[PDB]
């Protein structure tokens, strides 16, 4: 009955707290201090989580979930019925852990080297080349080089990874791993919904794409850019051409209206990584939201240490399932791109602190997209010229179009990429894309969604999806697509809460108490209620909608339509079979 169900949830919740705290600190101590000792501790905590998930998952399955009157109780048990990888037989479980470990390790130490020269790492070296170099062959060197070293070597583990992750999902009642990932959104019409949202943002992306293609035509020469074909993938200022903000200098509509180089101003005025997180902390507290505990400043790795090498530099925010212990781990470089990211990650820390009083089972975002949305919403206001000038990082209609272009290069360009990644994966998981098709189908979708072609023809043995962190690390990517849509919905709602009128893109909700209240009640729910409720608390409506993003960029869309029409651009890539010569 109901009494035995809540007895089970109570017992699960307190045992999970203890073991989850033990896993996280083990995961931290390894990631922040790589040693044989710290690795051994991690492996012992891995099999404990598996044992605990196996034990409590088996019991959770003994309950008939629909016989239960309490929905909070119902959700918790229905979650525990899914063991994830812990559903696998011992040998297959440990082989799956080996493969993930092998894929992550291969990705992390992969280096591209000159003949007699230095061996560059992805971050920050190859990232810097992609961002700053405006020479075709150098961009190509780093682009091809990374996919040859990282991607190629992941290909030996991926088919067996797919096999095992699919098996674990079938043992948990799903048809495949993609089915399992999509279920986290509890939305049967999910596929169609994301499809429709993608269609509504199409004309906005096509207009940006056409405009940027022309600018690249001007810089890289008519013999290297087809004005009716896909753009070569290595030219967008980013390794994965997922975000195009680094080529602002190439596309800025009015260099006639100049602005400060933000990275220059930051290094000059004595900005430290420590100080970038203080600034992000201040922005949250100005809204009346929770400050970070003192333990955060003591225990966080906000920059790489010098006492001893061997650390993982990837940016990440950590919940320790303690209620008191929350940390960020990042090898932050002092620049605008890392100042924005700092606000994003503090957004995760805020979310952790808000739902900390809930049982650990419900200590998550309303859906995986909600979690990444918080932090991005605030950063929108941080990104505004009004706020950046107040940070001494900047100095009128022409300035306005400039800013909107900069935000389009960040936000609009990402839309097709975030959609693209899991469109590929779901088809890999369901078996419509096989290991002979891996790379061809990746580039089919790169062309179809993004209008990109490879700069160099790909060969058998190439596994370019494996050059993107989230692939060998097995982190679902559709969360970011949902994130980018709903963050403009939140923005729109928080700005009218703050009583802001006029163009939505000018809104800066800094120090807005009413706006802080909205997010606070939404984040307090955690995973306890279906996400349409938290969506309704913030926006008034329960749906994901593209309208707010479309409303935000309306002035830029109008401007691009006008500009593309007069220059005689064909929108899209009609000559879609074109590749470089």
């Amino acid at each position: 009955d109901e009494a035995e169900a809540s007895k089970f949830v109570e017992e699960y919740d307190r045992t999970s707290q203890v073991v989850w705290n033990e896993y996280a600190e083990a995961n931290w101590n390894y990631n922040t201090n790589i040693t044989t000792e710290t690795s051994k501790i991690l492996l012992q905590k891995n099999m404990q989580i598996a044992n605990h998930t196996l034990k409590y998952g088996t019991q959770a399955r003994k309950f008939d979930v629909n016989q239960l009157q309490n929905t909070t109780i119902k959700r918790i048990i229905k979650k525990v019925q899914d063991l994830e990888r812990a559903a696998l037989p011992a040998q297959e479980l440990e082989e799956y852990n080996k493969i993930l470990l092998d894929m992550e390790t291969t990705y992390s130490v992969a280096t591209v080297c000159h003949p007699n020269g230095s061996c560059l790492q992805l971050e920050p070296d190859l990232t810097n080349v992609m961002a700053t170099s405006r020479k075709y062959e150098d961009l190509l060197w780093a682009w091809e080089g990374w996919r040859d070293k990282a991607g190629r070597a992941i290909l030996q583990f991926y088919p067996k990874y797919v096999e095992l992750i699919n098996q674990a999902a079938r043992l948990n009642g799903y048809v495949d791993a993609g089915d399992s990932w999509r279920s986290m959104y509890e939305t049967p019409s999910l596929e169609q919904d994301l499809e429709r949202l993608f269609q509504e943002l199409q004309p906005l992306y096509l207009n940006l794409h056409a405009y940027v293609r022309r600018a690249l035509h001007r810089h890289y020469g008519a013999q290297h850019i087809n004005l009716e074909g896909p753009i070569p993938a290595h030219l967008l200022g980013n390794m994965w051409a997922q975000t195009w903000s680094n080529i602002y200098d190439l596309v800025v509509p009015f260099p006639s209206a100049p602005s400060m180089d933000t990275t220059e101003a930051m290094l000059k005025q004595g900005w430290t990584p420590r100080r970038m997180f203080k600034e992000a902390d201040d922005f949250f507290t100005s809204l009346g939201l929770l400050p970070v505990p003192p333990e955060f400043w003591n225990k966080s790795m906000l920059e790489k240490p010098t006492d001893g090498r061997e650390v993982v530099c990837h940016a990440s925010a950590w919940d320790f399932y303690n209620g008191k212990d929350f940390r960020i781990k990042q090898c932050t470089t002092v620049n605008l791109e890392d100042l924005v990211v700092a606000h994003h990650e503090m957004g995760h820390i805020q979310y952790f602190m808000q739902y900390k009083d809930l049982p650990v089972a419900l200590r998550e975002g309303a859906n995986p997209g909600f979690h990444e949305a918080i932090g991005d919403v605030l950063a929108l206001s941080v990104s505004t010229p009004k706020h950046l000038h107040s940070l001494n990082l900047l100095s009128s209609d022409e300035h306005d179009i400039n800013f909107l272009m900069k935000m389009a290069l960040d936000k609009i360009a990402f839309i097709p990429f975030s959609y693209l990644v899991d469109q590929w994966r779901w088809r890999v998981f369901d078996g419509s894309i096989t290991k002979e098709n891996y790379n061809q189908e990746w580039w089919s979708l790169r062309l179809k969604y993004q209008g990109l072609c490879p700069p160099v023809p790909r060969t058998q043995g190439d596994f370019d999806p494996g050059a993107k962190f989230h692939i060998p690390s097995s982190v679902p990517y559709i969360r970011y697509f949902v994130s980018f849509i709903i963050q403009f919905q939140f923005h729109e709602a928080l700005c009218q809460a703050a009583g802001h009128t006029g163009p939505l893109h000018k809104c800066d909700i800094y120090q807005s108490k009413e706006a802080g209240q909205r997010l606070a009640t939404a984040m307090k729910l955690g995973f306890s209620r279906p996400w349409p409720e938290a969506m309704q608390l913030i926006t008034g409506q329960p749906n994901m909608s593209a309208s707010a993003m479309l409303s935000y960029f309306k002035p830029l869309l109008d401007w691009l339509r006008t500009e593309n029409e007069l220059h005689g651009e064909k929108l899209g890539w009609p000559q879609y079979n074109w590749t470089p010569n």
């Binding site: 999970s16 990888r85 919940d319 200590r363 998550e364 989230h470 970011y480």
Partner: peptide, 11 residues
């Protein structure tokens, strides 16, 4: 999904 939610990472 019974495992502890991994640390959150950027896109």
């Amino acid at each position: 999904q019974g495992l502890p939610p991994r640390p959150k990472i950027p896109p």
